[PDB]
RNA sequence: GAUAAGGGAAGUCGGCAAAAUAGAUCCGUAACUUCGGGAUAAGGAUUGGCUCUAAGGAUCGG
RNA sequence: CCCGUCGCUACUACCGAUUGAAUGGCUUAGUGAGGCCUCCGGAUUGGUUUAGGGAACCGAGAAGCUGGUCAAACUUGGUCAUUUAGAGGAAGUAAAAGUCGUAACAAGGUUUCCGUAGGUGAACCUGCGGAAGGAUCAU
RNA sequence: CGGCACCUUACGAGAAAUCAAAGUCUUUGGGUUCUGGGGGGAGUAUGGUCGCAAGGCUGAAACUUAAAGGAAUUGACGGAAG
RNA sequence: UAUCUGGUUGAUCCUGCCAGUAGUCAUAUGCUUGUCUCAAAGAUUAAGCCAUGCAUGUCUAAGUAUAAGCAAUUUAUACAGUGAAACUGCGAAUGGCUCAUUAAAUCAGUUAUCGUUUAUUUGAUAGUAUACUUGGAUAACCGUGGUAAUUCUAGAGCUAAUACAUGCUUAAAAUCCCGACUGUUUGGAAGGGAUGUAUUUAUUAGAUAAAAAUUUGAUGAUUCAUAAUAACUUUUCGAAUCGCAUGGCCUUGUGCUGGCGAUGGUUCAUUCAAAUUUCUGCCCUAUCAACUUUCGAUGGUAGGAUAGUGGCCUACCAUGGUUUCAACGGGUAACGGGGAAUAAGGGUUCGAUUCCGGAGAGGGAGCCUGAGAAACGGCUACCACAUCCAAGGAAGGCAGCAGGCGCGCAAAUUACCCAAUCCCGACACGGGGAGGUAGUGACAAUAAAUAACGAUACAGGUUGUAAUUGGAAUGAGUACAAUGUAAAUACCUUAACGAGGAACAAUUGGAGGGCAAGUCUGGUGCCAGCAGCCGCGGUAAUUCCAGCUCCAAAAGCGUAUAUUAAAGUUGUUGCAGUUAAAAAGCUCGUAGUUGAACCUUACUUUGAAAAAAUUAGAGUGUUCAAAGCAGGCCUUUGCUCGAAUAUAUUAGCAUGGAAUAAUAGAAUAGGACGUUAUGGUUCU
């Protein structure tokens, strides 16, 4: 038959379902960033856990190793490129010191809210889901779209959105047309 | 069908090997020809790859070579007189390789003139393969050994 | 099983064809021909996946059925014809000539050549022995048999075939210092000079080859193809990159500078 | 004293009487056992005539 | 606190006359389909082809036939393996704490335990030799 | 020097009783043999093997159960002592 | 994330298990279910049984055309275009399915064929000592038929070939044999035969260590390639074939010559293959310790058979071969492997299943054709099932696709298509249930709605809500349309419609502890029940049945089994054995393991190898992501980075090092050097 298509899980659940300290930390962090559920935190923890695993593996290797230099520089460059890691912490020792709030800072919902296009973070999420926000000249309706630094300045309302120069929406057109 | 595979046998340690696969055509076998002496009758057999083999069922004459003079003539053969494998073949006059036969001496005599009427020969051909009973003439120590074995 | 196989699953195809996983279940099974199955490039792959002149197999079949494609100076209409190493493909309708030479990355480069260079090819002598009527002959790497060779020709040499008469123009003796391309292993596509040949009777002879960057590697003698009389003097045009192997970090730096 | 279609102990107190087996070579041989047996256990194959082949010895001669 | 016969109920496994039964594999022996090879065979059917009525003699060649070879399948016997019936016998566990006693835990009222051998409704008792995990690290 | 032991301490070990080994064992590796994997069923059944026999060696499963057990503390009790 | 917590007691510290907890490319099942992408699916039990339909056919200018087929009169009165039927060629041995058997068997890595067969593809290769071109069958076809019945076929009348069976055409020499005559110092010769290539023998070349008294190939290795001599052969084949163009020379002839192609053909080489084959490596079991050898078991000699090696088989002859370093036997709810789950490391469990290798088509066995089959969508026979019958007979093989029954805890449509991927055929054109597309599909995976923002009123600390008041936004859904596609569906775009209880209403399990969340209200009263465990329940139950409230995860949540972690409760890393379970009663002792110091290998480094897929990982805005291997450039009659790389690991190969650990050496010297030491015996 045809070749298999690869797929993988993007999260992992905690081993202890009920732990007040972890439940409160997750709920507080979800309330701060307007997340729908805990799986988006499991996803962030999973991808940071594998970034850390890669960094740990390179850090156990000797310095000046060609492989350590190549994949470590690629991973650091990617993290600076995606804005999670600051420009003054390119040492592969601060990657282990990285935290989930660094990744949650770079979400589209967070950047739109911090750019003022929405009243609150939940208004930011509904603005994204309702196809009003465009990054560059492309409409993005995924709240978890991680905004790069070079894409940061091009976040604005979609040109065909009611809030961005488009025609009036269904409700307004129904009201003003009567 | 007769086959050559070692699957039917048991291992060196004695273990009875189980049934692995059914018999394959690419290892078959066929019956011995048992060449006799009589009017030249050969049957061609369709072998693997499109080749052809010629069973010598019975033959009368084949070419025999005198090694000392480098001369090969087609001459009659009387019968097989000594066979290291089986004496039943000697008794029933079955022509196979390594079998001592007696040949008509007239062509070798006539060549000798131009340059007991039956000469000994050893068939080197494989009649069950090619259909020819071709051999050479005993001379020297080979001759002495076979004559000692024949007379006893 | 009961006879020769006629299909090739896409996942089981040679990796240097660079076929995609999801384009289908099967891959083109190369026909019998001058080159081995694993070391060849079918014309459907060359004309559709590499040059992208044809968009699909119906078009490659229409192209070849209009008599456009010639390999080594003869018209081929077999869509699965096994084109291989050093073969010359000429499409005079588009006025294009290609030579199939490995690049240092292990794949068949798209290396265009002039018609004058497309008028010949090189072949590695595999064996010298006597034919019928006691006539010696040479077998090259693409299965060619050339009669009445130069009595100095021995195994592992390379001859230059006129490719229009099938005769031998001239040859190169196998010796220290000759330019070589590797035709097998993980050093596929690399070009260098012989420094020292280490023999192993009853086994596989090993050849030590030095890169243009003074990198030394060892490979089996069966993977060595002489392409020039000395360093920097190949008998065929080399593909882009000149057979110099760069580390992955150096390649990353070069691509970054080239793209900005 | 013999033989007998089909059945095969239905006869009779009861297989009484008769039948069946039977020499030799080769194969194979259970429970149990006091380890000695049971054992020819049970159960199978072969056997003529003729023409051959092979093996097995004695006395002399260094 | 606790041990055990005995009585009732339920469940599990074991032994057990029945030369018990059933299913599957391997195999001795007998019979043996079919194909293949070989040996003859020679329906008819062409002429090496010759003939003033035609006498021939050459080839191909079907059925069939002889002897071998591979060998399906059936019957009998042996053996292995897995399920399963069984009068009766002897256990184990659970339930309730029904009867009889009080063997053990205190020197448990005969110190206890181990090996062995007898005896006895039952726990158990007794002999012989050990142990302290003793009720003595000691005169 | 070799033995049979003993007295004190605990650097150290151990759940503790205690231990000159039961120490040098999460700072885990000197060499080597045997045995156990919750309690029962059970050293039972079956097969094998040794034995004159008694029995010995090897040795299950079905089923059942939430503990059984080790060392020590306080109390209660003793037909034990002061 | 290298984690633990509840349960033995009046209370304590332990051993230890039971219970809790999380994942599963791990299956089933319950409740529930809005969106996008991706996508498994009658393996498990029964390799149990199958109705029906389909799944393998095929023609170019180029094999054979008098279809009484179509079409037009045209460069054509031999045919000539197109083209059924048949004969011929090729394919049908690929693919697809399944995992019953199978434990040195398959398989993996690594080897060998100087031990063989090989259609086809691609190169070479053939002047060999009636010719203006040989025969007679046969199909289709016409018309007589028999049977109830089948892809049954028989008589009669035709006719063809690249079918079948036969056959010449040719260089120039040269060489060899026999040899009348002749020369007569050993020569010359008329006349007869033979030369290419295949077969089968026998005998010769096929050389190659360096000065004095003309050739000869390869290999690590050959009796190799090849040549020569003497013969042999129910004598192999060295084109009686087919299409397009029609050219050149004139000694005015249907004269002599010739261009591109089809197909075919011998041998060698190549390629696609096949078959054997070296080394090392497989789960449980000793309640399997000896097995193999009648009637092949191990080896020797000769033969037969094979494509070939080989006890593969036969004849004769020896008594060998394996084994406690586990042979042999038994079991497997066993195809092997790439791989999958979980995992600090080491490990444990799984692998029917997308790829490779093997085997099979109800169970056996035997075969034809063919290069290739012991083939089953081929045949013959038996056994078991099973279909029609007029009972005379005939026909079967879904572990292919779909579909039906059974079995079960367990698994979908008797759909569309050759458009993509490729395969087959005489082939640009036909065919392909291979494959693709859609249907069913909560197996798993990715992303992601169920609302958002103001004002009052209050409470509240310059702002978070709790309610009743507004105006905005939107997709689920429906749809013109375009895109998509073979045609559709769906996705994506997009006119018009589409939200206040925005009823367009989120569920599954729980609230004593473990374990997050009630000592609230009502009901029962050791009942009903809950409860993985401890326990709760006998009239104010924090535990049952309900209402309210609350907790966890959420388009998912719960339950069962297996497995992994937890489990240092399998312990090599890494357990315990005085008393919790566990040192044999005590010594000897073989295999095994380990062995004081001192001056051939093993080990270790590097290289080559370990298929693709999978894993890790570089690049790359699929709108993000899972993924994919794409893509990017001022908009291009074109320019242009890519598709890395690691890891594999036992066995084999090459290499450097000589510690560590083995092994050998000169004790009756049977020792080492004399390179040009002195002689003697030889061999090339």
From Swiss-Prot, chain A:
Taxonomic superkingdom: Eukaryota
Any GO BP: translation
Subunit: Component of the small ribosomal subunit. Mature ribosomes consist of a small (40S) and a large (60S) subunit. The 40S subunit contains about 32 different proteins and 1 molecule of RNA (18S). The 60S subunit contains 45 different proteins and 3 molecules of RNA (25S, 5.8S and 5S).
Source organism per UniProt: Candida albicans (strain SC5314 / ATCC MYA-2876) (Yeast)
CDD domains in the cross-refs: S4
Entries under Pfam families matching the protein: Ribosomal_S4, S4
Name of this chain's protein: Small ribosomal subunit protein uS4
Signal peptide extent: none
Keyword flag RNA-binding: yes
SMART domains linked to this entry: Ribosomal_S4, S4
Gene for this chain: RPS9B
Curated annotation (Swiss-Prot), chain B:
PANTHER family, per the entry: 40S RIBOSOMAL PROTEIN S8
Organism: Candida albicans (strain SC5314 / ATCC MYA-2876)
Biological processes, Gene Ontology terms: maturation of SSU-rRNA from tricistronic rRNA transcript (SSU-rRNA, 5.8S rRNA, LSU-rRNA); translation
Subcellular location: Cytoplasm
Alphabetized GO MF terms: structural constituent of ribosome
Primary localization: cytoplasm
InterPro entries per record: Ribosomal_eS8 (IPR001047), Ribosomal_eS8_CS (IPR018283), Ribosomal_protein_eS8_euk (IPR042563), Ribosomal_Se8/biogenesis_NSA2 (IPR022309)
Location of region: Disordered: 1-36
Matching NCBIfam families: eS8
Superkingdom, natural source: Eukaryota
Alphabetized UniProt keyword annotations: Cytoplasm, Ribonucleoprotein, Ribosomal protein
Role, per record: Component of the ribosome, a large ribonucleoprotein complex responsible for the synthesis of proteins in the cell. The small ribosomal subunit (SSU) binds messenger RNAs (mRNAs) and translates the encoded message by selecting cognate aminoacyl-transfer RNA (tRNA) molecules. The large subunit (LSU) contains the ribosomal catalytic site termed the peptidyl transferase center (PTC), which catalyzes the formation of peptide bonds, thereby polymerizing the amino acids delivered by tRNAs into a polypeptide chain.
Sequence similarity: Belongs to the eukaryotic ribosomal protein eS8 family.
Protein name: Small ribosomal subunit protein eS8
Keyword Ribosomal protein: yes
Complex and partners: Component of the small ribosomal subunit. Mature ribosomes consist of a small (40S) and a large (60S) subunit. The 40S subunit contains about 32 different proteins and 1 molecule of RNA (18S). The 60S subunit contains 45 different proteins and 3 molecules of RNA (25S, 5.8S and 5S).
GO cellular component: cell surface; cytosolic small ribosomal subunit
Pfam families linked to this entry: Ribosomal_S8e
Swiss-Prot record, chain C:
Keywords: Cytoplasm, Ribonucleoprotein, Ribosomal protein, RNA-binding, rRNA-binding
PROSITE patterns cross-referenced by the UniProt entry: RIBOSOMAL_S4E, S4
Domain KOW, first and last residues per copy: 177-210
Gene Ontology MF terms: RNA binding; rRNA binding; structural constituent of ribosome
InterPro entries: KOW, Rib_uL2_dom2, Ribosomal_eS4, Ribosomal_eS4_C, Ribosomal_eS4_central_region, Ribosomal_eS4_central_sf, Ribosomal_eS4_KOW, Ribosomal_eS4_N
GO cellular component: cytosolic small ribosomal subunit
GO biological process, one term: translation
Domain S4 RNA-binding: 41-104
Gene3D superfamilies in alphabetical order: 2.30.30.30, 2.40.50.740, RNA-binding S4 domain
Subcellular localization, as worded in the UniProt entry: Cytoplasm
UniProt cross-references to Pfam families, sorted A to Z: 40S_S4_C, KOW, Ribosomal_S4e, RS4NT, S4
Family annotation (CDD domains): KOW_RPS4 (cd06087), S4 (cd00165)
Family per similarity comment: Belongs to the eukaryotic ribosomal protein eS4 family.
Function: Component of the ribosome, a large ribonucleoprotein complex responsible for the synthesis of proteins in the cell. The small ribosomal subunit (SSU) binds messenger RNAs (mRNAs) and translates the encoded message by selecting cognate aminoacyl-transfer RNA (tRNA) molecules. The large subunit (LSU) contains the ribosomal catalytic site termed the peptidyl transferase center (PTC), which catalyzes the formation of peptide bonds, thereby polymerizing the amino acids delivered by tRNAs into a polypeptide chain.
PANTHER family from the UniProt entry: 30S/40S RIBOSOMAL PROTEIN S4 (PTHR11581), SMALL RIBOSOMAL SUBUNIT PROTEIN ES4 (PTHR11581:SF0)
Subunit structure: Component of the small ribosomal subunit. Mature ribosomes consist of a small (40S) and a large (60S) subunit. The 40S subunit contains about 32 different proteins and 1 molecule of RNA (18S). The 60S subunit contains 45 different proteins and 3 molecules of RNA (25S, 5.8S and 5S).
Protein name per the record: Small ribosomal subunit protein eS4
């Amino acid at each position: 038959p045809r070749a298999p298509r690869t797929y993988s899980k993007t999260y992992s659940v905690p081993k202890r379902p009920y732990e007040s300290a972890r439940l409160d930390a997750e709920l507080k962090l979800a309330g701060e960033y307007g997340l729908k559920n805990k799986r988006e935190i499991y996803r962030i923890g999973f991808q940071l856990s594998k970034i850390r695993r890669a960094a740990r593996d390179l850090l156990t290797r000797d310095e000046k190793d060609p492989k350590r230099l190549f994949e470590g520089n690629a991973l650091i460059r990617r993290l600076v490129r995606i804005g999670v890691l600051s420009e003054d912490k390119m040492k592969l020792d601060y990657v282990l010191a990285l935290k989930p709030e660094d990744f949650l800072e770079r979400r589209l919902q967070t950047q739109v809210f911090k750019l003022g296009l929405a009243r609150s973070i939940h208004h930011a999420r509904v603005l994204i889901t309702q196809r009003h926000i465009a990054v560059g000249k492309q409409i993005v309706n995924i709240p978890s779209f991680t905004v790069r630094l070079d894409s940061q300045k091009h976040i604005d309302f979609a040109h065909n959105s009611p809030y961005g120069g488009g025609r009036a929406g269904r409700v307004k057109r129904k009201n003003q047309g009567k | 069908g007769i086959s050559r595979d070692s699957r039917h046998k048991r291992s060196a340690t004695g273990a009875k090997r189980a049934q692995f696969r059914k018999k394959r055509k690419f290892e078959l076998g066929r019956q011995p020809a048992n060449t006799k002496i009589g009017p030249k009758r050969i049957h061609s057999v369709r072998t693997r790859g499109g080749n052809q083999k010629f069973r010598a069922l019975r033959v009368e004459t084949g070419n025999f070579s005198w090694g000392s003079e480098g001369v090969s003539r087609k001459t009659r053969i009387a019968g097989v007189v000594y066979h290291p494998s089986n004496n039943e073949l000697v008794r029933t006059n079955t022509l196979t390789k390594s079998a001592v036969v007696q040949i008509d001496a007239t062509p070798f005599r006539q060549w000798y003139e131009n340059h007991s009427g039956r000469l000994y020969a050893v068939i080197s051909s494989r009649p069950g393969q090619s259909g020819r009973c071709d051999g050479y003439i005993l001379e020297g120590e080979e001759l002495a050994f076979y004559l000692r074995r024949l007379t006893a | 099983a009961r006879g020769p196989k006629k299909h090739l699953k896409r996942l089981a195809a040679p990796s240097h064809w660079m076929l995609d996983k999801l384009s289908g279940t099967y891959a083109p099974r190369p026909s019998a021909g001058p080159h081995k199955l694993r070391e060849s490039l079918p014309l459907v792959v060359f004309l559709r996946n590499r040059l992208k002149y044809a968009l699909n197999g119906r078009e490659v079949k229409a192209i070849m059925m209009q008599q456009h494609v010639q390999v080594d100076g003869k018209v081929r209409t077999d869509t699965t014809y096994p084109a291989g190493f050093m073969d010359v493909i000429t499409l005079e309708a588009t006025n294009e000539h290609f030579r199939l030479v490995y690049d240092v990355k292990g794949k068949f480069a798209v290396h265009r050549i002039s018609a004058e260079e497309a008028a010949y090819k090189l072949g590695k002598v595999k064996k010298v022995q006597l034919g019928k009527k006691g006539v010696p002959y040479v077998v090259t790497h693409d299965g060619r048999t050339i009669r009445y060779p130069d009595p100095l020709i021995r195994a592992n040499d390379t001859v230059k075939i006129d490719l229009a008469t099938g005769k031998i123009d001239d040859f190169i003796k196998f010796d220290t210092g000759r330019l070589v391309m590797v035709t097998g292993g993980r050093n596929l596509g690399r070009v260098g000079v012989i420094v020292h040949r280490e023999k192993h009777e009853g086994g596989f002879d090993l050849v030590h080859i030095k890169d243009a960057l003074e990198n030394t590697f060892v490979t089996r003698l069966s993977n060595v193809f002489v392409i020039g009389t000395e360093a920097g003097k190949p008998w065929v045009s080399l593909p882009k990159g000149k057979g110099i192997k760069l580390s992955i970090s150096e390649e990353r730096d070069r691509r970054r500078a080239q793209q900005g």
